[PDB]
Ligand binder design. Structure first.
Ligand SMILES: [Mg+2]
Ligand SMILES: [Mg+2]
Ligand SMILES: [Mg+2]
Ligand SMILES: [Mg+2]
Ligand SMILES: [Mg+2]
Ligand SMILES: [Mg+2]
Ligand SMILES: [Mg+2]
Ligand SMILES: [Mg+2]
Ligand SMILES: [Mg+2]
Ligand SMILES: [Mg+2]
Ligand SMILES: [Mg+2]
Ligand SMILES: [Mg+2]
Ligand SMILES: [Mg+2]
Ligand SMILES: [Mg+2]
Ligand SMILES: [Mg+2]
Ligand SMILES: [Mg+2]
Ligand SMILES: [Mg+2]
Ligand SMILES: [Mg+2]
Ligand SMILES: [Mg+2]
Ligand SMILES: [Mg+2]
Ligand SMILES: [Mg+2]
Ligand SMILES: [Mg+2]
Ligand SMILES: [Mg+2]
Ligand SMILES: [Mg+2]
Ligand SMILES: [Mg+2]
Ligand SMILES: [Mg+2]
Ligand SMILES: [Mg+2]
Ligand SMILES: [Mg+2]
Ligand SMILES: [Mg+2]
Ligand SMILES: [Mg+2]
Ligand SMILES: [Mg+2]
Ligand SMILES: [Mg+2]
Ligand SMILES: [Mg+2]
Ligand SMILES: [Mg+2]
Ligand SMILES: [Mg+2]
Ligand SMILES: [Mg+2]
Ligand SMILES: [Mg+2]
Ligand SMILES: [Mg+2]
Ligand SMILES: [Mg+2]
Ligand SMILES: [Mg+2]
Ligand SMILES: [Mg+2]
Ligand SMILES: [Mg+2]
Ligand SMILES: [Mg+2]
Ligand SMILES: [Mg+2]
Ligand SMILES: [Mg+2]
Ligand SMILES: [Mg+2]
Ligand SMILES: [Mg+2]
Ligand SMILES: [Mg+2]
Ligand SMILES: [Mg+2]
Ligand SMILES: [Mg+2]
Ligand SMILES: [Mg+2]
Ligand SMILES: [Mg+2]
Ligand SMILES: [Mg+2]
Ligand SMILES: [Mg+2]
Ligand SMILES: [Mg+2]
Ligand SMILES: [Mg+2]
Ligand SMILES: [Mg+2]
Lengths: 18, 110, 102, 46, 56
RNA sequence: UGCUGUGAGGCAUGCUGGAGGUAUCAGAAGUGCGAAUGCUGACAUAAGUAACGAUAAAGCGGGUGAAAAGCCCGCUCGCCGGAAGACCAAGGGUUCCUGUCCAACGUUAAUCGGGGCAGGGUGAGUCGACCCCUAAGGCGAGGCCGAAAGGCGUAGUCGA
RNA sequence: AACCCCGGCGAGGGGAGUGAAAAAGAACCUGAAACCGUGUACGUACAAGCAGUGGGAGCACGCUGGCGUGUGACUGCGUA
RNA sequence: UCUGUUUACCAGGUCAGGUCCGGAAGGAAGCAGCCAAGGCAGA
């Protein structure tokens, strides 16, 4: 669902470049 | 062993802070922490902060047991004071002094 | 007319590195050079996530004044001073002591 | 109360504006003095 | 009216001799929770004289 | 700090300082400060005193948050209503809207702002300016006048 | 001034590290005076005045029973 | 003498996860969760 993509996506992602 | 914690350029006058500083001089930091908690002043929360910081310093850096600590030296000095301007009636103006102060707390197991 | 250049092997006259020898990486405009294995400083680097740069203490090489380094004569094993002559029609460098070209 | 400066643009520029100075001998002397003191702006222009 | 001579730090000290605050002596210890608090005032957890009279 | 000279002074030396100083006899002086309601900066004093800008007025619940009398939400209360409302011209020039921050600024706190930083935002054949036309008034080819600069004015050309 | 710690992902601070030195930390050479303090010695709550000077007890600290140092109860004279 | 409740590291036991030694066999210090337990309030 949406919140899964929102959370997980920039969670893993945002965790890596930031 | 003596430990320092300071807060420099705090807004409050030296004078106002002194009132509170002189409440806690000499006590063991537990009893003193409480003195500060239930004092109603601004200076009180400033100095509370600095004292707590001081405890953290002692324990973490110098390995002091919290129970033993007393407040051995606590003094408030004058800080750099900033000029402002308040306009007054009939045109004259007033250089205002917004005062600051240096709160310096030092604790020791002895 | 520039005496010390890229890739020259030099010896260090002055500083904590006095006596050490090495290879020139590059030169800077201010008359400073940066030499291999020479003048290491320990620099603190705040970790940067964009460049994937970890933190930590990086040993880096800090510029040294070019007056302080001498061009190393490999023949004589001594520091030397340099001069210029015209061979062919070209401007060339030589060592003052044995007056041999580079 | 009613103070001394009641601003107007058209007024400002007809009175002190560049062209107004340049109109006359005296004005061009002003602009001479200013250029000699090396001001950031000579006249009042926008 | 305004003073005639600059009053010395001495006088200035005297006037302030009364300005000292009074540290509150007692910290009452509530029975149930055990936290310290003021006489007649509720605790940080809303305890008073053994009740929890505030849920908060 | 100690010693020494009749005096302005001198010598020695502990700490501080971290690179300039200068015997002797001469030479030249921006050569010695407590006053000048002296000039600049700094810090006092009154004093934690007066004051916090309309006597239209606040109260509670919840939210956010390190911290909420003041911010957002809801609910009652109260004031303006020929204005304390709505739209322009002037004048200002980004103050507009969003996010974010709280040192300084805001006469208190401020999580809020007309404060800081970043982004966005102003869409015209018919609304204005421009443009066409002139008023008072201005400039003014020739021209008249005037020691010089310049003054007046014709044809004109500007000026809402 | 990497990293650790208190704090509000603050301010500021404390360790750590660089450096000859960080009482060199960007509010940064040297850091005087006024002005404000914390600590220690001495004196001060029956005492009248340009606040010192002459005399002077005690107390404290240095010395080797005396000599310095600080303080100055009490009294002579004393209107910048 | 029993009930609730709490009490991060610095009483104890189990010690998941992870981590040290070892090629492997396995040990090991021990965070967290649990249990005594430190208590206390009520009885
Ligand atoms: Mg005015
Ligand atoms: Mg008088
Ligand atoms: Mg008072
Ligand atoms: Mg030094
Ligand atoms: Mg030194
Ligand atoms: Mg000299
Ligand atoms: Mg001479
Ligand atoms: Mg002079
Ligand atoms: Mg002077
Ligand atoms: Mg005189
Ligand atoms: Mg005066
Ligand atoms: Mg200045
Ligand atoms: Mg003043
Ligand atoms: Mg004062
Ligand atoms: Mg008064
Ligand atoms: Mg009063
Ligand atoms: Mg008044
Ligand atoms: Mg009042
Ligand atoms: Mg008001
Ligand atoms: Mg609330
Ligand atoms: Mg509320
Ligand atoms: Mg209000
Ligand atoms: Mg509301
Ligand atoms: Mg009416
Ligand atoms: Mg107008
Ligand atoms: Mg406009
Ligand atoms: Mg702006
Ligand atoms: Mg807005
Ligand atoms: Mg905003
Ligand atoms: Mg404020
Ligand atoms: Mg407030
Ligand atoms: Mg605050
Ligand atoms: Mg803004
Ligand atoms: Mg139209
Ligand atoms: Mg006309
Ligand atoms: Mg003509
Ligand atoms: Mg004319
Ligand atoms: Mg026209
Ligand atoms: Mg026009
Ligand atoms: Mg019109
Ligand atoms: Mg910091
Ligand atoms: Mg070192
Ligand atoms: Mg300073
Ligand atoms: Mg230097
Ligand atoms: Mg300095
Ligand atoms: Mg100093
Ligand atoms: Mg000083
Ligand atoms: Mg009597
Ligand atoms: Mg007596
Ligand atoms: Mg008297
Ligand atoms: Mg005597
Ligand atoms: Mg002794
Ligand atoms: Mg003696
Ligand atoms: Mg004596
Ligand atoms: Mg006497
Ligand atoms: Mg006399
Ligand atoms: Mg007398």
């Amino acid at each position: 669902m949406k919140q899964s993509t929102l959370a997980l996506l920039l969670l893993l992602l945002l965790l890596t470049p930031v | 062993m003596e430990t320092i914690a300071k807060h420099r350029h705090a807004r409050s006058s030296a004078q106002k802070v002194r009132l509170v500083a002189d409440l806690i001089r000499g006590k063991k930091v537990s009893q003193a922490l409480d003195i500060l908690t239930y004092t109603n002043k601004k200076a009180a929360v400033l100095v509370k902060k600095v004292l707590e910081s001081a405890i953290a310093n002692a324990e973490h850096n110098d390995g002091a047991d919290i129970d033993d600590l007393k407040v051995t030296k606590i003094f408030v000095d004058e800080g750099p004071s900033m000029k402002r301007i308040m306009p007054r009636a009939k045109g004259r103006a007033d250089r205002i002094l917004k005062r600051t102060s240096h709160i310096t707390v030092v604790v020791s197991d002895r | 007319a520039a005496k010390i250049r890229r890739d020259d092997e030099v010896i260090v006259l002055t500083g904590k590195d006095k006596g050490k020898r090495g290879k020139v990486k590059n030169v800077l405009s201010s008359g400073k050079v940066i030499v291999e294995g020479i003048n290491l400083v320990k620099k603190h680097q705040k970790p940067v996530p964009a460049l994937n740069q970890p933190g930590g203490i990086v040993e880096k090489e800090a510029a040294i004044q070019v007056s302080n380094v001498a061009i190393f004569n490999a023949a004589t094993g001594k520091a030397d001073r340099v001069g210029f002559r015209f061979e062919d029609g070209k401007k060339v460098r030589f060592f003052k002591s044995n007056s041999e070209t580079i | 109360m009613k103070r001394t400066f009641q601003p107007s643009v058209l007024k400002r520029n007809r009175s002190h504006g560049f062209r107004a100075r340049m109109a006359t001998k005296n004005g061009r002397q002003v602009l001479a003095r200013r250029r000699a003191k090396g001001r950031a702006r000579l006249t009042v222009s926008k | 009216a305004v003073q005639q001579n600059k009053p010395t730090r001495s006088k200035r000290g005297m006037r302030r001799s009364h300005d000292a605050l009074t540290a509150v002596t007692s910290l009452s210890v509530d029975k149930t929770s055990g936290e310290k608090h003021l006489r007649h005032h509720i605790t940080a957890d809303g305890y008073y004289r053994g009740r929890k009279v505030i849920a908060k």
